[PDB]
Amino acid sequence: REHWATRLGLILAMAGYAVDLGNFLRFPVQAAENGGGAFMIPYIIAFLLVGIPLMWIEWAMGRYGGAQGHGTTPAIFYLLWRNRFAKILGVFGLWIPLVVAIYYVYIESWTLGFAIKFLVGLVPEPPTDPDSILRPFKEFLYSYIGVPKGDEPILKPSLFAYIVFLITMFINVSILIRGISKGIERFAKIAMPTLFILAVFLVIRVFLLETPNGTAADGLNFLWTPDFEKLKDPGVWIAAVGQIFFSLGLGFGAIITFASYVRKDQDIVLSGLTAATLNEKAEVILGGSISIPAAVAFFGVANAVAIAKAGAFNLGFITLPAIFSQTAGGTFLGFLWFFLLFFAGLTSSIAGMQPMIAFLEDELKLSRKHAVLWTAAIVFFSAHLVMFLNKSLDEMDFWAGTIGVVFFGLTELIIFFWIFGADKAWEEINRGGIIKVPRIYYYVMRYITPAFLAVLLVVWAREYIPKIMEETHWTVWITRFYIIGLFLFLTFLVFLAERRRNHE
């Protein structure tokens, strides 16, 4: 079995998976909407009671599986719980990263496309008033993606967007096809320092932003002034749990698969805690210092509430590109911003497609070359639904990348800490640990952690599912039909794997 060559490479790869566009866009928006500086209270608590324990558990499950030659959840769940229902539950944890990759790589390709367009100077050049500056960039983005102009739910991406997606897939493949150590690990050792350098440069350039509407210091102020009254709203506590859960990338299956290449007695406690900490640092220090302060510096603290409510996507793909074009060398600054977003996405997507590759290698005995190429073919083909059908991305992101991950995260907890055995799980976590998990976390993992995920799951289900099922366009059923088909497809591959094993 492949293994990580160095501890540093392992940590940077895991951190690279966790650190993405969300660090620079989703977190600042969430904090600004949920109490500002006060949001750090439930955020730290959720990090300690949910993020950290679940992360150690996913690492533990992966390393446990890898020692027996299995990197994905269909086999791993069965090893933990030898039951037919376990193999079926395990399919979910292979279905999720497969479905997520189908839309994620496309989103990632947008950042490469925009980086190129900013670099060469092919961007709108306004003109005054905020709507006169934002609109040309809204149209710029809409034309690239092919946002519907009529009543039809059809997307028409530009030729450039489509070619860049091809290039983006090729880049993912070029890394993945070289494997864990010479591919993913080697890239992580370059991309992470680069990501750090770009971020620091952006923080510095943002802090120097001075407009008649305000400064960056006003942005840091608006973002980091505590509003303790919001701590009464349960939604703020729910948002913090969700923020921690998603930013760490728990429940997606990538962590488990990456951990499956950690040697049997190699540390995961300190390594996992370090990777998690790197994500948080990149999130609150780097992410919190770029996007929001820039938006507030340019549009004033008066529009600060409106900006955060506009969302992470609008902030990163419309508002920020617009602001840069109004500054000296902002064309190059926009390039750096999207270059940053591209590497942040690329480090995550190579981690996100590895589970499918691992399944083909471990369970169907495909060579790395064949496993990578077939995984790429499936993702590339399937992405055409995301590229051409309006809201297909949103539907995939909800079922797999939102509801699915929280459900699967809870399933992981139960199967590992309740079914497999709490004592065994604990020993599987701490074995080879450079530091030991504090004894108190045994109770947290067994009772507190699954309680938080259960509350998150139920609240989001009751809040979002009825709307999703009753207020959406009929075309969402195309996406539902297809991804249900993908689940049936993986179930069939698992069937073929076990029938091959019985033969050999």
Ligand SMILES: CCCCCCCCO[C@@H]1O[C@H](CO)[C@@H](O)[C@H](O)[C@H]1O
């Ligand atoms: C959900 C997956 C849909 C697959 C993408 C559909 C391919 C789109 O093919 C369409 O062919 C038309 C021919 O008249 C052309 O005019 C359009 O430009 C082209 O996009």
Ligand SMILES: CCCCCCCCO[C@@H]1O[C@H](CO)[C@@H](O)[C@H](O)[C@H]1O
């Ligand atoms: C989700 C899948 C949607 C794919 C978009 C398909 C592109 C539209 O293809 C359609 O082909 C028709 C051929 O009879 C033409 O007459 C239409 O005007 C053209 O829009």
Ligand SMILES: CN[C@H]1CC[C@@H](c2ccc(Cl)c(Cl)c2)c2ccccc21
């Ligand atoms: C998990 N938070 C980020 C990190 C990884 C990144 C991600 C997760 C799984 C996969 Cl399969 C891929 Cl390709 C990419 C991602 C996707 C959707 C939503 C959020 C996120």
Ligand code: NA
């Ligand atoms: Na993150």
Ligand code: NA
């Ligand atoms: Na990443």
